[PDB]
Write a protein that holds these residues in place. Structure first.
Motif, short mmCIF file in Angstrom:
data_model
loop_
_atom_site.label_atom_id
_atom_site.label_comp_id
_atom_site.label_asym_id
_atom_site.label_seq_id
_atom_site.Cartn_x
_atom_site.Cartn_y
_atom_site.Cartn_z
N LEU A 1 1.08 -1.28 0.18
CA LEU A 1 -0.66 -0.12 -0.45
C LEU A 1 0.72 1.41 -0.26
N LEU A 2 0.54 2.12 -0.80
CA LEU A 2 1.12 3.70 -1.20
C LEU A 2 0.22 4.47 -0.07
N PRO A 3 1.06 5.77 0.51
CA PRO A 3 2.53 5.92 0.38
C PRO A 3 3.33 5.41 1.53
N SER A 4 4.05 4.73 1.42
CA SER A 4 5.15 3.77 2.28
C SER A 4 5.41 4.29 3.01
N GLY A 5 4.95 3.69 4.29
CA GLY A 5 5.12 3.58 6.06
C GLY A 5 4.08 4.90 6.06
N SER A 6 2.98 5.19 5.10
CA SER A 6 1.69 5.86 6.24
C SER A 6 0.64 5.13 6.29
N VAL A 7 0.94 4.22 6.11
CA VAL A 7 -0.26 2.94 5.81
C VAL A 7 -0.25 1.80 7.28
N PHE B 1 -8.77 7.63 7.55
CA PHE B 1 -7.68 8.16 7.37
C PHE B 1 -7.33 8.98 9.33
N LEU B 2 -6.19 9.19 9.84
CA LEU B 2 -5.67 9.54 11.16
C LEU B 2 -5.01 10.68 10.85
N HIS B 3 -5.76 12.68 11.66
CA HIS B 3 -4.47 13.55 10.98
C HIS B 3 -5.30 14.16 12.09
N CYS B 4 -4.23 15.35 11.91
CA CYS B 4 -4.73 16.14 12.68
C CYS B 4 -5.49 17.88 12.08
N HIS B 5 -6.31 18.02 12.59
CA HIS B 5 -7.80 18.80 11.56
C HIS B 5 -7.25 19.64 11.62
N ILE B 6 -6.19 20.48 12.09
CA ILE B 6 -6.16 21.19 11.64
C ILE B 6 -5.62 21.81 9.69
N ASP B 7 -6.51 22.41 9.37
CA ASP B 7 -5.90 22.00 8.02
C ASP B 7 -4.49 22.15 7.30
N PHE B 8 -3.70 23.01 7.59
CA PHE B 8 -2.78 23.98 7.60
C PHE B 8 -1.99 22.81 7.18
N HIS B 9 -1.60 22.12 8.50
CA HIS B 9 -0.88 21.08 8.86
C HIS B 9 -1.12 19.66 9.07
N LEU B 10 -2.77 19.00 8.44
CA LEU B 10 -3.16 17.76 7.60
C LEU B 10 -2.03 18.20 6.50
N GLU B 11 -2.07 19.34 5.75
CA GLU B 11 -1.89 20.12 4.06
C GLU B 11 -0.15 19.70 3.79
N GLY B 12 0.03 20.16 5.24
CA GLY B 12 1.55 19.64 5.46
C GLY B 12 2.25 18.29 5.83
N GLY B 13 0.99 17.67 5.52
CA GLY B 13 1.35 15.85 6.01
C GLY B 13 1.11 15.79 7.34
N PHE B 14 0.20 15.64 8.65
CA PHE B 14 0.42 15.71 9.43
C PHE B 14 -0.84 13.86 9.33
N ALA B 15 -0.51 13.05 8.93
CA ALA B 15 -1.73 12.69 8.41
C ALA B 15 -0.89 10.65 8.43
N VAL B 16 -2.00 9.56 8.91
CA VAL B 16 -1.53 8.80 8.37
C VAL B 16 -3.48 7.72 8.18
N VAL B 17 -3.12 6.49 7.39
CA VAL B 17 -3.94 5.76 7.27
C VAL B 17 -3.78 4.80 8.23
N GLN B 18 -4.98 4.14 8.63
CA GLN B 18 -5.11 2.74 8.97
C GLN B 18 -6.13 2.55 8.55
N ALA B 19 -5.69 1.24 7.43
CA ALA B 19 -6.59 0.87 7.01
C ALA B 19 -6.79 -0.97 7.54
#
Ligand SMILES: *[C@@H]1O[C@H](CO)[C@@H](O[C@@H]2O[C@H](CO)[C@@H](O[C@@H]3O[C@H](CO[C@H]4O[C@H](CO)[C@@H](O)[C@H](O[C@H]5O[C@H](CO)[C@@H](O)[C@H](O)[C@@H]5O)[C@@H]4O)[C@@H](O)[C@H](O)[C@@H]3O)[C@H](O)[C@H]2NC(C)=O)[C@H](O)[C@H]1NC(C)=O
Ligand SMILES: *[C@@H]1O[C@H](CO)[C@@H](O[C@@H]2O[C@H](CO)[C@@H](O[C@@H]3O[C@H](CO)[C@@H](O)[C@H](O)[C@@H]3O)[C@H](O)[C@H]2NC(C)=O)[C@H](O)[C@H]1NC(C)=O
Ligand SMILES: *[C@@H]1O[C@H](CO)[C@@H](O)[C@H](O)[C@H]1NC(C)=O
Ligand SMILES: *[C@@H]1O[C@H](CO)[C@@H](O)[C@H](O)[C@H]1NC(C)=O
Ligand SMILES: [Cu+2]
Ligand SMILES: [Cu+2]
Ligand SMILES: [Cu+2]
Ligand SMILES: [Cu+2]
Length: 499
Positions: free
Chosen positions: A365-371, A450-468
């Motif tokens: 699964l992609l992106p690698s290391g975020s899922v 999706f599991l992320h910070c809900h400050i949208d500017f932070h989400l945009e900076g990549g403050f997120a991972v995926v729970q598959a």
């Protein structure tokens, strides 16, 4: 207001919620968008019509329905490149889902880049005909929804990557900036002698707000869609994406009272009626309040919130007493946020489409290391230790497709394995207090979430991972409509200037 079956038409329009005209993304002509409503058990068929023309605020779009489990409809959850490719301009897309086992206060917003900061956000209410709190209030309708929002005079893609606060806080779509201290304030009308279920919704893209009403106390009865025991407070700090229902008894003298929503940074306080709205009793003159703020002596503390009905915490009453424990180590480099060494970059093929195309392991699964692949029917514990390595605290983290128990809240060292509140957005606190906010949930919902910070500017900076979650069952559990299958080819066929 609108729904459960409705068209949601998305356009660019000039708006002036604080008297300052600017181009924004609007829903059915307005920002914030209209109230979407229904009842528990309803099938929602929300046709999102993308008529956007402005590339700067993105011509493509994707809508997330915040707080809904989306069991068997992972495809309609909303996050771009997780659950779908964006809807393309000149196209419509039908979000078709059920809410069989939830009631309460929710919201909807663009889940594509920082587009919801530009205006694509609105409240969403699911009523309960047998609401266990019904005896605590008399009125609950369109006029008892209170929305909070940060508003910027410069568009999300045009200002700083991380703005230092909004130009104005909007309450029910109106508020004041320093540029115009006579701008129209929102008025919330109450008839004396009635109790009102006010549904407070944070549509904020960054800052939290400390909410209070002069001369009135509030009884919290709902926390992000979860019924709570009645908690009397005189102020509520509400983080981005959180919701509360509170009962207000209109038992004071017929008068005008200041509604207050003080942001944590930016233009703080109430000079010239900023960060303010008006509580007007029927019969009071059409003027501004002159009421004074009193010190909060009963502020909301999350640890004081408990579910209305007995709700068992996933796992056993011990640190790591679960099937799977995950720690989230935060980093920040000036422009990007990292979780466990990875800054989220949206994949070309949406994670759900990858799964439907065979990818079932973290390796594939992609992106690698975020899922993160999660076992089915398992108890999960996730800790978010607060660190100075990631500035922007307190970070409100949100988990899609699930409600979770807050076993440890911010500003607390207690682990509550007995009766903690359940919710979907939680403040992770501050490194100053040595916070280690910890959550627990059960894996009852196959799909990528999706599991992320809900400050949208932070989400945009990549403050997120995926729970598959339960990857080998995802395809069978979430059959996808043809329209969904058609989203990616259409989007990928766009000229990049039409994105
Ligand atoms: C696509 O969307 C983006 C993002 O929303 C738009 O980006 C804007 O780009 C322009 C440059 O072309 C910037 O213009 C600046 O605006 C400053 C503030 O302008 C306000 O105050 C003025 C003085 O009081 C006032 O004249 C002006 O009103 C005019 O513009 C309004 C829309 O902005 C419009 O609704 C009114 O009818 C009126 O025409 C504003 O209230 C100004 O001081 C600068 O000198 C400069 O002109 C904007 O800041 C950008 N907007 C944002 C929110 O960042 C882009 O224009 C959009 N594209 C199209 C085709 O609409
Ligand atoms: C909202 O809740 C707060 C906290 O419970 C209430 O504040 C309390 O108000 C009462 C009545 O006004 C106060 O008692 C009174 O104090 C004054 C001055 O000391 C005294 O002259 C009176 O005889 C009476 O004892 C009480 O101190 C105060 N408590 C706290 C901790 O602040 C408030 O009344 C509630 N608001 C409404 C409108 O329901
Ligand atoms: C932060 O890291 C990202 C990679 O995740 C990189 O693209 C960016 O240039 C870095 N920004 C800095 C050094 O501020
Ligand atoms: C937070 O909790 C996790 C799991 O209990 C633990 O591994 C981690 O060390 C804690 N972090 C801090 C800084 O206390
Ligand atoms: Cu959300
Ligand atoms: Cu969500
Ligand atoms: Cu953050
Ligand atoms: Cu999200």
């Amino acid at each position: 207001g609108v729904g459960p079956v409705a068209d949601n038409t998305i356009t660019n329009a000039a708006t002036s919620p604080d008297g300052f005209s600017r181009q924004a993304v609007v829903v059915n002509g307005v920002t914030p968008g209209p109230l979407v409503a229904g009842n528990i058990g309803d099938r929602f068929q929300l046709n999102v019509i993308d008529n956007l023309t402005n590339h700067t605020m993105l011509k493509t779009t994707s809508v997330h329905w915040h707080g809904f489990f989306q069991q068997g409809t992972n495809w309609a959850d909303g996050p771009a490149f997780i659950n779908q490719c964006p809807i393309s301009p000149g196209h419509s897309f039908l979000y078709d889902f059920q809410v069989p086992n939830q009631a309460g206060t929710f919201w909807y917003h663009s889940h594509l880049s920082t587009q919801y900061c530009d205006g694509l956000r609105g409240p969403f209410v699911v009523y309960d005909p047998n609401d266990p709190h019904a005896s605590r209030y008399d009125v609950d309708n369109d006029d008892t929804t209170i929305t909070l929002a940060d508003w910027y005079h410069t568009a999300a893609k045009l200002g700083p990557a991380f703005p230092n606060g909004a130009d104005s806080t909007l309450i029910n779509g109106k508020g004041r900036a320093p540029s115009d201290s006579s701008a129209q304030l929102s008025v919330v009308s109450v008839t004396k002698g009635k109790r009102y279920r006010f549904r407070l919704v944070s549509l904020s893209c960054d800052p939290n707000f400390t909410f209070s009403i002069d001369g009135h106390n509030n009884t919290i009865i709902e926390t992000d869609s979860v019924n709570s025991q009645p908690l009397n407070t005189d102020s509520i700090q509400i983080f981005a994406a959180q919701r509360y229902s509170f009962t207000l008894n209109a038992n004071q003298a017929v008068d005008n009272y200041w509604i207050r929503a003080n942001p944590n940074f930016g233009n703080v306080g109430f000079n010239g009626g900023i960060n303010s709205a008006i509580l007007r009793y029927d019969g009071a003159p059409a003027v501004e309040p002159t009421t004074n703020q009193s010190t909060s002596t009963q502020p909301l503390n999350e640890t004081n919130l408990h579910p209305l009905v007995s709700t068992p915490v996933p796992g056993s009453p011990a640190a790591g007493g679960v099937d799977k424990a995950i720690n989230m180590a935060f980093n920040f480099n000036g422009s990007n946020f990292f979780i466990n060494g990875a800054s989220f970059t949206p994949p070309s093929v949406p994670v759900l489409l990858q799964i439907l195309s065979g990818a079932q392991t973290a390796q594939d699964l992609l992106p690698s290391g975020s899922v993160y692949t999660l076992p089915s029917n398992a108890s999960i514990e996730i800790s978010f230790p607060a660190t100075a390595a990631a500035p922007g605290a307190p970070h409100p983290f949100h988990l899609h497709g699930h409600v979770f128990a807050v076993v440890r809240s911010a500003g607390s060292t207690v682990y509550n394995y007995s009766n903690p509140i359940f919710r979907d957005v939680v403040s992770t606190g501050t490194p100053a207090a040595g916070d280690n906010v910890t959550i627990r949930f059960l894996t009852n919902n196959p799909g990528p979430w999706f599991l992320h910070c809900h400050i949208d500017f932070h989400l945009e900076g990549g403050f997120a991972v995926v729970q598959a979650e339960d990857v080998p069952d995802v395809k069978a559990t979430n059959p996808v409509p043809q329209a969904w299958s058609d989203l990616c080819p259409t989007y990928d066929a766009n000229a990049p200037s039409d994105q």
